[model samples]
Target: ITHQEKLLTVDTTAHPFLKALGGHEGTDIFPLFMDPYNGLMVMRASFAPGLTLPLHFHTGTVHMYTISGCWYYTEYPGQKQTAGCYLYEPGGSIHQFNTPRDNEGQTEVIFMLSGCNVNFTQDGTYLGLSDAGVIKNWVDRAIREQDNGLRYIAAAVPTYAA
Candidate 1:
């Protein structure tokens, strides 16, 4: 008998990087997959040199693989992640993401995340939130408004209730 469920592949060539709608201005992201039901997201993000993002709290586990350049969390200054490095952050982790000011070029990394990232200011003020559902909205809106060739696999059902 034939298989009812098949594999899903994303041709990165067909998916263009788009400016992040919620993150820092110097960041670009290529969304690969988003599952609202499971609150999972996979994407490649590029950060410009000298970029320092707000302190954030992760509600779920996150896996990151550095593809180019280097970066480190402000909370853990000694541990820097560079090309060919893999980093994992447990759920409920809190830290600030940053790239060195002298970076040669953009720092690229692929991330697989489960759940939301609640951002906060250095002084502890709430900034914003991001997750699979939030990112899906951004991607979909950018594709519709900008007409960019960006594409990603998304679940059929919505993340929030009506």
Candidate 2:
């Protein structure tokens, strides 16, 4: 099928998590919706024990829904989030992010993201943006492994006027 063809649903359970980037250890990403043109991506991300994303900020909005385990930012020590909770981060908000060590299981969350994430250091030194190229690379990988890339481009059904 072509990129514009009809693709109804995506079975996320059938897809596997792709590779990790930067210095992230025990971390993985499962791609969901990845819009190629402008780098808007929806993905399921997991962090194992002792892993952290550190102080970072996004160029666009980020919405996160916790799936399992728990986590909170060090900057907000009292605001830990557990399963079934939703969190919204406006663009350019900066803070140190981490999963709770108290939880022995992996922390998983569904993240709806747009634009690039910029990582920073303690002195406010700019590191760099997380790769947006991963979108294309991961999409191609999905197509090769489970034919999932086209699923996101499914044709919309036309509606009749009332």
Candidate 3:
């Protein structure tokens, strides 16, 4: 990001709640920006060289856009996500992924979190919407755990360079 180079596109600048995310957690946390007036929750996500996002669950659908730099998302157990496009996570599912951002450059993402009620189990397992309260509480716990770096990269996936 530079003083003169506009990082975002024209459509992004036209949004109401568009801004940089901040929190020192390798990334910045900006709350819902636009559509709050229309009862919608959204946020602008920005990541540094090596940022790790809190793994949690959402109560509603979340749409995302690759604003700048490079962004990556991976699914637990075994799923690899690539950058340079859009990503979406539907409601009632466990949102588990840690982003390293762009080592070569910074990364920016615009996400909307609506009805974000996270859930979990007593043993710290992702139950995925077992109950509304449980989800919220567990979600909180996950973020807390994330503060201590409770994360592991998925095992290598079979690949073909052809």
Using TM-score, give the best candidate's number: 1
After superposition on all CA atoms, what RMSD does each candidate show versus the true structure? 3.3, 6.3, 16.2
Model 1 agreement with the true structure over 109-139: per-residue lDDT tens digits = 9999998889899899997888788888888
Residue 99, candidate 1: how far off, in angstroms? 1.0
lDDT of 2 by residue, 1-162 (tens): 558565555666775665453335667666667664565777787878655665787888889999988888878879887899899998878877787667899888998877877879867888877645555565566466654343443223346876
Question: Which residue pairs come into collision in candidate 3?
Answer: 17-33, 21-28, 22-28, 22-29, 32-42, 118-135, 118-136, 119-135
Better of 2 and 3 by lDDT: 2
The list of candidate 1 runs beyond 4 A from truth reads 1-7, 158-162
Candidate 3: C-alpha lDDT: 0.48
In model 3, how large is the Cα lDDT of residue 133?
A: 32
- Pick by lDDT: 1 or 2, better one: 1
Tens-digit lDDT string for candidate 3 (24-117)? 3455433333232223445465566655444566667778777676645445424433355577778777654455534576566776555544
Ranking by TM-score: 1, 2, 3
Error of 1 at 5 (Å): 9.6
Q: After superposition, how far is residue 45 of candidate 3 from its true place, in Å?
A: 1.4
Ranking of all candidate structures by their lDDT, best first: 1, 2, 3
